[PDB]
Design a binder for these strands. Structure first.
Ligand SMILES: [Zn+2]
Ligand SMILES: [Zn+2]
Length: 108
DNA sequence: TTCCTAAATCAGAGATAACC
DNA sequence: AAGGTTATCTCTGATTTAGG
């Protein structure tokens, strides 16, 4: 009622408790999964917080540089350096890796 | 307590324009 | 000189947070 856990995954919380063939408790997810696939529900740890992880290195999807004064994003939604972004939004074509310049230039 | 609000802060898209 | 790449500037929107 309160100290029960899913015997397959160990989840202590669930929308609706279910029973396996042997009468033990399965969380809704696991229970449904078994009646569907006749196989235990595989445990698969959650993915990246898209931050506490993700932002652990950022290189442009096009030229793969790691530095830029401003990160933009391509259609696909991935980050791209300022240069590659501006170039594509002007020519609707990717910036040729033959343009990668040495270091970073400043102005004014 | 929890909710809601405010306002900072953050993130980028555009604009502007500096330098080769 | 004029052009073209793309640093910066300007904001609009989305997040993040301290309070009440
Ligand atoms: Zn389970
Ligand atoms: Zn790039």
């Amino acid at each position: 009622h309160m100290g029960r856990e899913c015997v397959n995954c160990g989840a202590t919380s669930t929308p609706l408790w279910r029973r396996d063939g042997t009468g033990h408790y399965l969380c809704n997810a696991c229970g449904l999964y078994h009646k569907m696939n006749g196989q235990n529900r595989p445990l698969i740890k959650p993915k990246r917080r898209l931050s506490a992880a993700r932002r652990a290195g950022t290189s442009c999807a096009n030229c793969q540089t790691t530095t830029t004064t401003l990160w933009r994003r391509n259609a696909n939604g991935d980050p791209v350096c300022n240069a590659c972004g501006l170039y594509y939004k002007l020519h609707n074509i990717n910036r040729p890796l033959t343009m990668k310049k040495e270091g970073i230039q400043t102005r004014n």
